[PDB]
Design a protein around this ligand. Structure first.
Ligand SMILES: Cc1c(-c2ccncc2)n[nH]c1NC(=O)CCc1ccc(Cl)cc1
Ligand SMILES: Cc1c(-c2ccncc2)n[nH]c1NC(=O)CCc1ccc(Cl)cc1
Lengths: 140, 140
């Protein structure tokens, strides 16, 4: 089972999520990202089991990444779903900040406001090797 | 002297340009990307020298990547300058298309309109390994 689940917003974080996958695999981690390891069957069940399976939950916060989570109180947004699973399983959540404006907790559904309590890592375009090293230090 | 020069628009193509650098290096190419190899001195001269020295010119076309080239008739825009240098040296130009709308030639300065005559590679988020294999096929 993968050690790392990468959760990301497809319309804005696909490239950074892919770059994280390559680097983490190079440092010996088993990584789940949907486009490489989400395979056949009902995706809702597979996505949840994949979040549960990985010790680490790497959350890619590209600009606007949580916009579709706002007022999603029925929890139909898939990043929202992935965050709730990670929170309820007590995963090692590692937010990666890439030009993301932190929202005030009151704009998010109650069940994911806790994601704002985890220490995040700032993605540095100028110092990417060092960013990668700090992420690895955060992984369990 | 590196084999591959990666030209990209910082505000929109940084992540893909970085991802291309990692993959190309893993396959044995020497890559120039500014954040790793632009060092001390007058950057204007070093950037032109680096384009002149690389057999391959990989052009990252993210959405809007050439907007700042338009009406840049004095050639002050750095992507515009890098493209003109690669064209004037007959480099192996390899455009990488990531959500980029092809402009009509007449909206671009005449000294770079020839960039549209080079066969490009469509970046596929779902088939990244195959995209990378295609890019390596295009490189010399
Ligand atoms: C406030 C603080 C500190 C800190 C405080 C005082 N003195 C030293 C360090 N360290 N880290 C944080 N807060 C984060 O990193 C949040 C990252 C984040 C952002 C958005 C989402 Cl949606 C989710 C997560
Ligand atoms: C038209 C064509 C063909 C082709 C033609 C006929 N039948 C089969 C294939 N193959 N390739 C191209 N054209 C490109 O790939 C341009 C890529 C590009 C895009 C934007 C910029 Cl600004 C610069 C470069």
């Amino acid at each position: 089972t993968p050690d790392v689940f990468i959760s990301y917003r497809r319309n804005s974080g696909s490239q950074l999520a892919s770059l994280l996958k390559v680097h983490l695999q190079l440092h010996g981690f088993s990584v789940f990202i949907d486009v490489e390891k989400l395979e056949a069957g009902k995706f809702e069940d597979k996505l949840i089991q994949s979040v549960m399976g990985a010790r680490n939950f790497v959350l890619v916060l590209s600009p606007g990444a949580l916009d579709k989570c706002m007022q999603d109180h029925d929890c139909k947004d898939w990043v929202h779903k992935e965050i709730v699973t990670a929170l309820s399983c007590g995963k090692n959540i590692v937010p990666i900040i890439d030009g993301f404006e932190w929202p005030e907790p009151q704009v998010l559904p109650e069940d994911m406001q806790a994601v704002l309590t985890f220490n995040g890592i700032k993605w540095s375009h100028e110092y990417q090797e060092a960013t990668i090293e700090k992420i690895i230090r955060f992984l369990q």
